[PDB]
Design a protein around this ligand. Structure first.
Ligand SMILES: *[P@](=O)(CCC)OC[C@@H](COCCCC)OCCCC
Length: 309
């Protein structure tokens, strides 16, 4: 029938999203009291996607601040380091040093190339973050939608020499204190618009059977000792099914987790990734603070455990 036409279809849909995102950002309040440093190349490459932004409170109470690392969403086909800027700014305004990266998009790369990009940005941060204010002893890793998928896999790969080898990455010299997933699509194989879902999975695996067998969080969680997770979302998330599926995997694997899941009664506006797309809404503030407090409580328990209070 056609590969070119399915692609053109998929891309039409992302052009639509891009227009809504542009219109929202033109309108929306911007968080105050933040500085950003933009467009750092994280490897020797002129690919514009292999860059990252850093965000900080305008007034730093300390030389180093606990770290947040954000992986944006967009269905693996869409987005860049700027997409989640308001969300990153909001988190930074609360007293955190924040990094958000670009990663090359499907179909130009497959999942391995995206995982490599993300690992390159993490390694860059391990080299250059602390000198400019990042406390890498307390690190919150977060991602929304496809970015939540990517965050969930990166958490497992960081812990596993076997997956490091399969994905062609090396572990980075810091740990994740918490991994917070916002409306993640962490089980993309369960998505099947069936031909379109199949097209995505094909583009993610790039035909590599090792990626097919390692495309879902359920396939990479096995046997690893992981940090705590936080699952964020709601019953009016278009992908709430994926959240329900993921809880079953957490329970079966003895993952430590907490949840902040909004009931349908909390309203029709609490849609897909609302707390990233609308930082200023009261429910977004509540959710995002609750995540930062959860991260702080874990960071305090680690400090106590390490005789460093
Ligand atoms: P996330 O990255 C939300 C991005 C808007 O979700 C992954 C989805 C894409 O969302 C629907 C497409 C139009 C917004 O995974 C692919 C769905 C197609 C079968």
């Amino acid at each position: 029938a056609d590969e070119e036409a399915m692609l053109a279809k998929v891309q039409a849909s992302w052009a639509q999203t891009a227009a809504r995102d542009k219109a929202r950002y033109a309108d929306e309040r911007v968080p105050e009291d933040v500085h950003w440093e933009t467009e750092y190349r994280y490897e020797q490459s002129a690919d514009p996607q292999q860059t990252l932004n850093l965000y900080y409170p305008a007034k730093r109470r300390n030389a180093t601040m606990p770290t947040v690392i954000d992986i944006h969403g967009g269905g693996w086909f869409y987005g860049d380091r700027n997409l989640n800027r308001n969300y990153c700014r909001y988190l930074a305004s609360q007293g955190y040093a924040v990094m958000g990266m670009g990663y090359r998009l499907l179909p130009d790369v497959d999942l391995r190339g995206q995982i490599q990009d993300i690992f390159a940005s993490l390694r860059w941060l391990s080299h250059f973050g602390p000198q400019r204010g990042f406390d890498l002893d307390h690190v919150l890793l977060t991602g929304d939608s496809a970015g939540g998928h990517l965050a969930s896999l990166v958490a497992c790969i960081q812990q596993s020499a076997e997956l490091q080898e399969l994905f062609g990455v090396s572990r980075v010299n810091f740990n994740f204190t918490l991994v917070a997933l916002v409306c993640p699509v962490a089980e993309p194989s369960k998505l099947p618009m069936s031909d379109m879902a199949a097209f995505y999975l094909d583009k993610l695996s790039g035909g590599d059977q090792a990626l097919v067998d390692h495309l879902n969080f359920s396939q990479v969680v096995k046997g690893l000792d992981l940090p705590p997770f936080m699952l964020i979302g709601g019953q009016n998330d278009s992908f709430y099914l994926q959240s329900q599926a993921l809880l079953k995997v957490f329970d079966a694997n003895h993952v430590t987790y907490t949840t902040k899941l909004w009931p349908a009664s909390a309203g029709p506006h609490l849609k897909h990734v609302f707390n990233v797309q609308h930082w200023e809404w009261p429910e977004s503030i509540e959710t995002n603070l609750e995540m930062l407090r959860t991260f702080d409580a874990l960071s305090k328990q680690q400090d106590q455990a390490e005789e460093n209070e």
